[PDB]
Design an enzyme around this catalytic site. Sequence first.
Site, PDB file in Angstrom:
ATOM      1  N   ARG A 191       0.803  -1.213   0.000  1.00 29.17           N
ATOM      2  CA  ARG A 191       0.000   0.000   0.000  1.00 29.17           C
ATOM      3  C   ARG A 191       0.843   1.274   0.000  1.00 29.17           C
ATOM      4  NH1 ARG A 191      -2.633  -4.295   2.052  1.00 29.17           N
ATOM      5  NH2 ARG A 191      -4.927  -4.440   1.903  1.00 29.17           N
ATOM      6  N   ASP A 220      -3.744 -15.878   7.658  1.00 23.32           N
ATOM      7  CA  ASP A 220      -2.474 -16.341   7.109  1.00 23.32           C
ATOM      8  C   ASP A 220      -1.603 -17.125   8.110  1.00 23.32           C
ATOM      9  OD1 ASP A 220      -3.140 -14.999   4.672  1.00 23.32           O
ATOM     10  OD2 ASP A 220      -2.479 -13.108   5.569  1.00 23.32           O
TER      11      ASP A 220
HETATM   12  O1  LIG Z   1      -4.722  -7.051   1.748  1.00 21.24           O
HETATM   13  C1  LIG Z   1      -3.766  -7.660   2.176  1.00 21.24           C
HETATM   14  O2  LIG Z   1      -2.648  -7.190   2.365  1.00 21.24           O
HETATM   15  C2  LIG Z   1      -3.983  -9.134   2.447  1.00 21.24           C
HETATM   16  C3  LIG Z   1      -5.319  -9.586   2.808  1.00 21.24           C
HETATM   17  C4  LIG Z   1      -5.550 -11.086   3.040  1.00 21.24           C
HETATM   18  O3  LIG Z   1      -6.255 -11.770   1.858  1.00 21.24           O
HETATM   19  P1  LIG Z   1      -7.869 -11.821   1.747  1.00 21.24           P
HETATM   20  O4  LIG Z   1      -8.393 -10.413   1.422  1.00 21.24           O
HETATM   21  O5  LIG Z   1      -8.072 -12.673   0.497  1.00 21.24           O
HETATM   22  O6  LIG Z   1      -8.308 -12.371   3.141  1.00 21.24           O
HETATM   23  C5  LIG Z   1      -4.237 -11.910   3.333  1.00 21.24           C
HETATM   24  O7  LIG Z   1      -4.656 -13.280   3.415  1.00 21.24           O
HETATM   25  C6  LIG Z   1      -3.185 -11.634   2.241  1.00 21.24           C
HETATM   26  O8  LIG Z   1      -2.014 -12.417   2.494  1.00 21.24           O
HETATM   27  C7  LIG Z   1      -1.512 -13.435   1.569  1.00 21.24           C
HETATM   28  O9  LIG Z   1      -1.349 -12.337   0.590  1.00 21.24           O
HETATM   29  P2  LIG Z   1      -0.806 -12.529  -0.966  1.00 21.24           P
HETATM   30  O10 LIG Z   1      -1.773 -13.339  -1.746  1.00 21.24           O
HETATM   31  O11 LIG Z   1       0.549 -13.221  -0.862  1.00 21.24           O
HETATM   32  O12 LIG Z   1      -0.690 -11.137  -1.631  1.00 21.24           O
HETATM   33  C8  LIG Z   1      -0.307 -14.002   2.250  1.00 21.24           C
HETATM   34  O13 LIG Z   1       0.664 -13.140   2.261  1.00 21.24           O
HETATM   35  O14 LIG Z   1      -0.244 -15.134   2.702  1.00 21.24           O
HETATM   36  C9  LIG Z   1      -2.544 -14.533   1.131  1.00 21.24           C
HETATM   37  F1  LIG Z   1      -3.554 -13.962   0.522  1.00 21.24           F
HETATM   38  F2  LIG Z   1      -1.929 -15.351   0.333  1.00 21.24           F
HETATM   39  C10 LIG Z   1      -2.817 -10.086   2.316  1.00 21.24           C
END
Ligand SMILES: O=C(O)C1=C[C@@H](OP(=O)(O)O)[C@@H](O)[C@H](O[C@@](OP(=O)(O)O)(C(=O)O)C(F)F)C1
Length: 445
Positions: free
Chosen positions: A28, A321
């Site tokens: 962000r 997570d």
């Molecule tokens: O807005 C954010 O920063 C995140 C919101 C969440 O997803 P949802 O809105 O789908 O609940 C987390 O689960 C996500 O973390 C992961 O984020 P990434 O996919 O890699 O970007 C993680 O780090 O493990 C997971 F979603 F895999 C990061």
Amino acid sequence: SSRPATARKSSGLSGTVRIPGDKSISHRSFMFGGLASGETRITGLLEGEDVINTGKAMQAMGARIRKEGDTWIIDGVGNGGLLAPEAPLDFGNAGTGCRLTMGLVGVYDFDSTFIGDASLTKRPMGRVLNPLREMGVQVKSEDGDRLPVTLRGPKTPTPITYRVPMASAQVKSAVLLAGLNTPGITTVIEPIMTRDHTEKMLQGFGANLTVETDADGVRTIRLEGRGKLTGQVIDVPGDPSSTAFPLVAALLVPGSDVTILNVLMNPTRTGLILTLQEMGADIEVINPRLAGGEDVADLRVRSSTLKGVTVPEDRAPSMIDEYPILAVAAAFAEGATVMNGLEELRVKESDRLSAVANGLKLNGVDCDEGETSLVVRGRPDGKGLGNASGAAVATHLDHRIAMSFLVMGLVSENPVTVDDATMIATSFPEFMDLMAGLGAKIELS
Ligand SMILES: O=C(O)C1=C[C@@H](OP(=O)(O)O)[C@@H](O)[C@H](O[C@@](OP(=O)(O)O)(C(=O)O)C(F)F)C1
């Protein structure tokens, strides 16, 4: 290709370490810094591959990003100023960068294409593409609303009031970012709170964004579109999801005493700590303070004997997570740990519920995988756990599965091997060095 790694039983983990920056806030920071008017300066940014990809996508649309000393400095284009990208925006493994950027740029009147790796390409985008269609964005996606996706915004986007159907901070975030270039008031209704970095940061950049919480918990988030955003000085707190790995390791490995510095303590991110404490964990919260506009504290963690507990479906959003690493802690706890409300785990970097269940079973753990739940019965002494034959846990390109099982191997009687450690750098490139510094024995192929 990939590179396996094997974790071996360790004598106490000991030391004090600063955890890398929070990934959610880091993404962000690049996005808002790149969009805002003027300069944004960022300290403590996570430099994992995921964040770097978001930075490159913002540069592709006109933001200038550079690193001077330990500070990332961004010259933003101003709200409404994003430029049409020449080529597809490659988000690699980053769901967050992809989902949020779709909302951010999909409402602009130019084409934008989104692509990613084998993992990201299998994940659902419909949850974000549906509200964008309501806002007037034209969508070209692969069957099932999967990447590659090409978006084309209308000349004038339509503001919507969207009730997010699942507890997703990314969907909430995508709709709010779409709202920035949409005239009128965009409203997102969140029945259960999810991490609120988007709301807090946009308010910090000057957006006319308000959050009202009903006594029943429902959040009504309103954003006035096409308003000015002003560059900010940002100080990124330590990642609480990354903290979970050395923290659980210190709880499980006997003779351990580890202090993790500058950890983000926003309650939408601390469900694991609360859960581990209910299990009997010795986690001391030291010097709670306000830093960069966020709650942070240092955490001193010492070896603890744990007992299984029931983890309610409503706590899920606050530790979504951390279910993989919690499942590993449960494998060493007395009794059964029961976790429900896990449907969202199936659509992450990997289907985490299936990947955790299979990895635990491969390493001798008694567990039952349900469609939306997991029960784990532990063996406190670690006897019979791990895999003596050296069979590798299938990570399915999910760095949290790789890190969770490497932590398990520091505790189990037999070593734990993961089929790939190369994706760990997506959010925690410092992982191997950090764990080795505390005394962990992890051998990379
Ligand atoms: O807005 C954010 O920063 C995140 C919101 C969440 O997803 P949802 O809105 O789908 O609940 C987390 O689960 C996500 O973390 C992961 O984020 P990434 O996919 O890699 O970007 C993680 O780090 O493990 C997971 F979603 F895999 C990061």
